[PDB]
Amino acid sequence: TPTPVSYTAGFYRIPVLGLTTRMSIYSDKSIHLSFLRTVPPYSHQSSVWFE
């Protein structure tokens, strides 16, 4: 849902942006040259489990 405008305005060789989203799909470094989380994703509870 925070995902469409990142695709449109991520076409233009747009560097990394930090936006407080809920994109898990932010480790897909071809389809976005622009994502940076400021909150851990849905999967990132795993090392929190590992401890």
Binding site: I25, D28, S30, I31
Partner: protein
């Protein structure tokens, strides 16, 4: 977003590999990059490279 089919061969999209959506309606290219590796294997099985 539109549920409409789009096909083709064309341009800069030479064997594009991505995590496209499930509900997208579009097919493109020809062989996969691993089917390409399979023909690269058939190439190396011609001269035992």
């Amino acid at each position: 977003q539109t549920l409409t089919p789009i096909l083709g061969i064309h341009g800069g999209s030479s064997m594009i590999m991505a995590d496209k959506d499930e509900s997208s309606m579009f097919f493109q290219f020809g062989p996969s990059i691993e089917q390409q590796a399979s023909v690269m294997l058939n190439i190396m099985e011609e001269y035992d490279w």
